[PDB]
């Protein structure tokens, strides 16, 4: 979908 | 000469393709991407 | 609702990528439906002072 942010990537994968 | 103009749509497409190649979905699901890598942090502001 | 130019945040909030802070973390957020409703509430309160 929409282009992700590199700051949100670590939030997602930290889960 | 590799030519990239100032148009926003083409730059958005290039950014999306680069993000797909550098951060593929399959590596994200398998928790195989390191967000602290320099070449990943650089992608934030390349072709804005 | 209109949005500002992304280059404003590109050249100021994420000018150095080696560090992260509150604003840099928050620039990656996307609102849900209730948060957009809260935005409409804020604007409605702005257009009726007092």
> Portion of residues in helices of chain B?
40-55%
- Termini gap of chain B: 20 Å
| Count of separate DSSP helical elements of chain B | 3
Shape of chain B: elongated
Kindly report how far apart the N and C termini of chain A lie: 20 Å
Order of helices and strands of chain A: H
- How many β-strands of chain A, per DSSP? 0
Which two chains form the greatest contact, residue counts included? A-B, 9 and 14 residues
Number of E-type strands of chain B: 0
Helix-strand makeup class of chain B: mainly alpha
Which quaternary structure do these chains form? Answer: part of a larger assembly
Helix content of chain A: 55-70%
Specify the overall morphology of chain A. elongated
User: What fraction strand of chain A?
Assistant: under 5%
Name its key features.
part of a larger assembly; 3 chains; A: 15 residues; mainly alpha; 0% strand; elongated; B: 48 residues
Walkthrough of the structure:
This is part of a larger assembly, with two copies of chain A and one copy of chain B (about 50 residues). Chain A contains one helix and no strands. Chain A is mainly alpha-helical and about 15 residues long. Chain A is elongated. Chain A has one helix at about 5-15. Helix content of chain B is about 50%, strand content about 0%. Chain B is elongated and about 35 Å long. Chains in contact: A-B, A-C, B-C. The interface of A and B includes residues 3, 4, 5, 7 and 10 of A.
